[PDB]
Structure 1
Amino acid sequence: PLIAAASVIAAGLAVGLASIGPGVGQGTAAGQAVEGIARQPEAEGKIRGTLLLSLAFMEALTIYGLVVALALLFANPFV
C-alpha cells in the first residue's frame, strides 16, 4: 500500500495536468481557426481538416496522459 498508493497519486496528477493544458491550447486553436473560417467563409473544408489535425495533436497529448493514468491504474508494473 506504499508504491501502489504512489503510482495511483502519480496517475491522478498526470491525468489532471495533461488534460488541463493542451485542451485549453486546443481551445485557443479553435477560436482563431473558427473566427477566420467564419470571416473568410471560403476554405471551411481545409480549415476543418487542419482543425481535425490540431484536435488530434492536443487530444493525443491528453490521451497519452490518460493512458499513463490507466497503465498505473490497471497494470502497475512498478507497483
Structure 2
Amino acid sequence: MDMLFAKTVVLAASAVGAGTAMIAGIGPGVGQGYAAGKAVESVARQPEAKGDIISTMVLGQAVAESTGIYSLVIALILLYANPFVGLLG
C-alpha cells in the first residue's frame, strides 16, 4: 500500500467511528428530562424548596451528562488528534 491510501482508509473509519460514538447522547437527554420533570412537579407543590430542588437537579443531571461527554471526547480525538495516522508506516 501507498501511504495516502493507508491514511485515507484509517481516517474514513475514524469518521464513521466518531459519529457512531455520538449515539450515546440519547441517554442523557432521556434521563435529564425526567429529572427536569420531577423538579417542575416539586416546585409547584413546594415553592419554598426551590433552592434545594434546583441545586439537587443540576448535581444529579451533571452526573448523568458524563457518558455524553466521554463519547464527545472520543469523537474529537478521532477528528482532531487522530492517534492512528502516526502508527502508520
1:36-51 alignment runs, 5 A limit: 36-51=42-57
With normalisation by structure 2, the TM-score equals 0.76
Q: Matched residue pairs, number?
A: 78
Deviation track 1:36-62 (CA, whole Å, cap 9, x = no partner) reads 122122211011111111221223322
Shift in Å, 1:6: 1.0
**Counterpart AA for 2:76:** L
With CA pairs under 8 Å and 6+ residues apart, which has the higher RCO, 1 or 2?
1
Identity of aligned residues (%): 59
The runs of 5 or more residues in structure 1 that have no matched partner are: none
With normalisation by structure 1, the TM-score equals 0.84
What secondary structure does 1:77 align onto?
coil
Is 2:12 aligned against 1:12?
no
- Please state which structure has a larger fraction of its residues in helix: 2
Report the Cα distance in structure 2 between the residues aligned to 1:37 and 1:63, rounded to whole angstroms.
29
1:64-79 alignment runs, 5 A limit: 64-79=70-85
- Contact 1:23–1:62, Cα closer than 8 Å, also in 2: no
Rg bigger for which structure?
Answer: 2
The runs of 5 or more residues in structure 2 that have no matched partner are: 1-7
